[PDB]
Amino acid sequence: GGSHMKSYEIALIGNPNVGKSTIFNALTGENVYIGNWPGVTVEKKEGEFEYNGEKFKVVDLPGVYSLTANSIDEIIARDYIINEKPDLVVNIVDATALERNLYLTLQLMEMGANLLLALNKMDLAKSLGIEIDVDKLEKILGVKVVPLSAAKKMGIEELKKAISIAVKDK
Ligand SMILES: Nc1nc2c(ncn2[C@@H]2O[C@H](COP(=O)(O)OP(=O)(O)O)[C@@H](O)[C@H]2O)c(=O)[nH]1
């Protein structure tokens, strides 16, 4: 007997230095396990948060620019996405270098990942005069995008909500 909280598995992936760690910490806080991927010194962060009565397991994937097989990072990440089948892939994208960030995003879509796009660093883009038409972006990609500035703690609660929804979309 007892309670059964419905549970989900989500993965965070993006280029290095886009706010992945910042977003991971904001989502999971103190519930966090830090270890290595097997037989390797690549860090594996996992944690969970609870939202609207459901449990969300988060795994931080290694930062990568592409999902070929040019590094063990890429191999680890690709193998996880294809073969561990997360309920949702949150692709964290840096608004201050969209074009280069989207290279990875495209491969992700092309793998049939259940995608949600977290468009981070909106504040940095604003201050550098970088213009992003978020709507045009959603439309062209055909994936939901959530603008935020995780370091400034804005849009994180949006992200949480959008995640709880994009997950029921498997
Ligand atoms: N301006 C700005 N900086 C950010 C934001 N999110 C993260 N950063 C900074 O970007 C740098 C890299 O963030 P981090 O989470 O370590 O990126 P990661 O390598 O993808 O895991 C850090 O100095 C963060 O403080 C944001 O929304 N706006």
Name the closest-CA residue to atom 18, ligand 1: 17
Experimental method: X-ray
Q: Which of 108, 124, 120, 168 is nearest to 145 (CA)?
A: 120
Q: What separation in angstroms does the CA of 51 have from each of 28, 46, 54, 121?
A: 11, 17, 5, 24
Cα-Cα-Cα-Cα dihedral sign, residues 19, 37, 27, 139: positive
Q: Which of 88, 64, 84 is nearest to 74 (CA)?
A: 64
Domain locations in the chain as residue ranges: 1-170
Task: Give the dihedral of Cα atoms 32, 35, 36, 38; nearest 10 deg.
Answer: -100
Query: 29 a known binding residue?
Result: yes
Resolution (A): 2.2
CATH for 1-170?
A: 3.40.50.300
* Residue found by looking up tokens 């989207």 in the block: 102
Q: Phi and psi (nearest 5°) for 42?
A: -75, 130
Q: How far is the CA of 19 from the centre of ligand 1 (A)?
A: 4
Test site for ligand 1: of 13, 17, 27, 127, most ligand atoms within 8 A of the Cβ: 17
Name the closest-CA residue to atom 9, ligand 1: 19
Task: Give the dihedral of Cα atoms 93, 97, 100, 101; nearest 10 deg.
Answer: 0
Q: What is the DSSP letter of 155?
A: S
